[PDB]
Amino acid sequence: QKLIANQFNSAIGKIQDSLSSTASALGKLQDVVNQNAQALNTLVKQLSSNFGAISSVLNDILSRLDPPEAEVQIDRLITGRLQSLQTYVTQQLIRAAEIRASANLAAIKMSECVLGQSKRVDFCGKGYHLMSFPQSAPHGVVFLHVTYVPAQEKNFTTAPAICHDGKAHFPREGVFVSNGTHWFVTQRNFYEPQIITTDNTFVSGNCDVVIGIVNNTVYDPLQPELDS
Amino acid sequence: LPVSMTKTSVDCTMYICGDSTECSNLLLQYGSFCTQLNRALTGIAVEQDKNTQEVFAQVKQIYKTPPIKDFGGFNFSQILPDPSKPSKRSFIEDLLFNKVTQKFNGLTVLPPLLTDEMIAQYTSALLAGTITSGWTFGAGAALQIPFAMQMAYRFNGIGVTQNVLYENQKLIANQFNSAIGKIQDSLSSTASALGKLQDVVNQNAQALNTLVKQLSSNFGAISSVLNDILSRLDPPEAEVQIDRLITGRLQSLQTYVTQQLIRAAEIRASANLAAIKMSECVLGQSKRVDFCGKGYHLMSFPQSAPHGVVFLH
Amino acid sequence: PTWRVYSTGSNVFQTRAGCLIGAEYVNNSYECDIPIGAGICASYQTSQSIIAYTMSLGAENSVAYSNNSIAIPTNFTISVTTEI
């Protein structure tokens, strides 16, 4: 517990430094804001385009000409600006589709990573997922996935099954490993050897059919205490 | 599943005018349309590389299997890379490549960021990781483990005790090899399984052909050869005719870049699906029924294809 | 003469994506900083200059697989990763 707590606090500290650093992992949100500003600025600049008209200022046309020709010039401006609006709106629909898809993915991430725990590997962050804390951000959301990463691996010799008295033995949950001279059954994700016993294994048929089986004594917990 | 499309790009001024200075002058009146349109194509182009990156770059180390392929009887020769071949593509990746089957008007085709060789290398690395260390390399450092044991406790994810696997190792090996042979025959046969990728290629190709073909249309103008109008007509009437032709070509490009955006959004919705499928079906064992192929899922192997990925569940 | 300077000289390198000028090609492999195309990438490195190189996919790692060798983790590290 103590080591886990210290590691967690240090991890949060590293996150704080990384976000406060001069770099910026928030480029995704910045891209959305910049894209919207880009589209808006383009739409505004389109107003100055004349589209073949004598001028882009509508009041000049209304004042410089009489209506029998101003309608034609205005029609050209109408066509150009209308086309600009159509392009802008269509682009907004496509971006809206992308944002909605991302939003739905975020909602699923919230339900499956913040509320519960997800078996889906690599979904709720890299490595085995423990939990996630959400954080608000302008126009978006930031998830702090807390994950478990094993480390300090060691080489070990193993056998898929153990033969004790002709009957094969298999690990109930762990796997059989040896340090080079003694065999042990241990947990699958964290080295914690235990003596092989009839309580952590189950029997299934003869040893002859199991490939790679290794003969090794299996301990019984009852007989060593039956002093009667 | 398709993963990307050809990174197309077009010079707006070249396509609309093709060196005609007069047409360029007229195009100046329309403002930022060419920049905004070409800005949209660049975004799509970057999106393709982003999709491929999100799909195949999920592995941080380029693992490689040792030469002693003693995988408990399982023959993985058809999927492992061919060192004797010039390209390092696997055997099944040679059938995929062989089964799958313009610049004049300012159109261009940028090459993808990742070449086929490196894509094949990523697939080989993923195969090595899955074969030698199971899902451990996905979560963190790769931990070697015998393949037989991996399959043995992989059955625990299907509620079947590992004793069944150890008691029937030979039978499972034979069945697996036979099934691999069937896949080999199916792809070698005339089966249209690759229709999904072929449709993407054909769609983009015919779209480009339509865009080029549209230039011959006059759009109500006296002709479609731009130099012809400027030759037969003096500048005053030429302006109204060239303006009509400019409007028509602009409309065609707008239709071409609007369809491309929609088709890019779809192909990137497919890419995200492929990425999640790879992360769950290759780097792990998903309990999601029918997500990683029909039936209870055991494992999956990815194999590179043109503009896409082919999973063997 | 700026465009002429950046068109002549030995700082020219043909590539499938096109001709690259100004940058200097190197044999060392590194992570793709800036993507050029066809696997080539450019970055700023030491004086300082703009180098061109084949992007390194990563560090190779020959897993010591065998029919009886198993690796078990003897420690763990809790980590936090940001997503946006």
Ligand SMILES: *[C@@H]1O[C@H](CO)[C@@H](O[C@@H]2O[C@H](CO)[C@@H](O)[C@H](O)[C@H]2NC(C)=O)[C@H](O)[C@H]1NC(C)=O
């Ligand atoms: C591997 O572990 C075994 C069993 O622990 C070691 O044999 C000794 O066995 C007795 C009884 O179990 C223990 O009290 C000793 O602690 C064990 N010795 C040691 C050094 O652990 C065996 O020697 C160990 N081998 C290695 C590679 O350390």
Ligand SMILES: *[C@@H]1O[C@H](CO)[C@@H](O[C@@H]2O[C@H](CO)[C@@H](O)[C@H](O)[C@H]2NC(C)=O)[C@H](O)[C@H]1NC(C)=O
């Ligand atoms: C496990 O023990 C069995 C039985 O001893 C081994 O099979 C052989 O069986 C004959 C007849 O019982 C014995 O004479 C041999 O001595 C046995 N060989 C050995 C090596 O003990 C089986 O091979 C043994 N397996 C292992 C891994 O030791």
Ligand SMILES: *[C@@H]1O[C@H](CO)[C@@H](O[C@@H]2O[C@H](CO)[C@@H](O)[C@H](O)[C@H]2NC(C)=O)[C@H](O)[C@H]1NC(C)=O
């Ligand atoms: C594994 O499969 C490969 C490919 O099938 C075998 O290589 C060849 O297999 C064909 C039959 O399909 C034989 O006619 C050739 O003589 C084989 N050549 C080689 C390299 O031996 C390979 O023999 C099979 N066995 C393993 C496990 O490698």
Ligand SMILES: *[C@@H]1O[C@H](CO)[C@@H](O[C@@H]2O[C@H](CO)[C@@H](O)[C@H](O)[C@H]2NC(C)=O)[C@H](O)[C@H]1NC(C)=O
């Ligand atoms: C596993 O490694 C950790 C390293 O984090 C060991 O615990 C200590 O962790 C603190 C940081 O919170 C370090 O300052 C200490 O130096 C670490 N001590 C050791 C022994 O490395 C943890 O005890 C190790 N557990 C084992 C050896 O299984």
Ligand SMILES: *[C@@H]1O[C@H](CO)[C@@H](O)[C@H](O)[C@H]1NC(C)=O
């Ligand atoms: C395991 O042993 C092999 C062979 O001795 C060696 O190459 C490998 O580096 C070892 N692995 C570890 C994690 O020590």
Ligand SMILES: *[C@@H]1O[C@H](CO)[C@@H](O)[C@H](O)[C@H]1NC(C)=O
């Ligand atoms: C493991 O491989 C070695 C060397 O090829 C061989 O001698 C041994 O019998 C094999 N054991 C099993 C269980 O496959």
Ligand SMILES: *[C@@H]1O[C@H](CO)[C@@H](O)[C@H](O)[C@H]1NC(C)=O
């Ligand atoms: C660099 O690569 C080129 C590629 O042909 C090769 O000719 C040259 O010898 C290499 N130089 C070094 C120092 O690796």
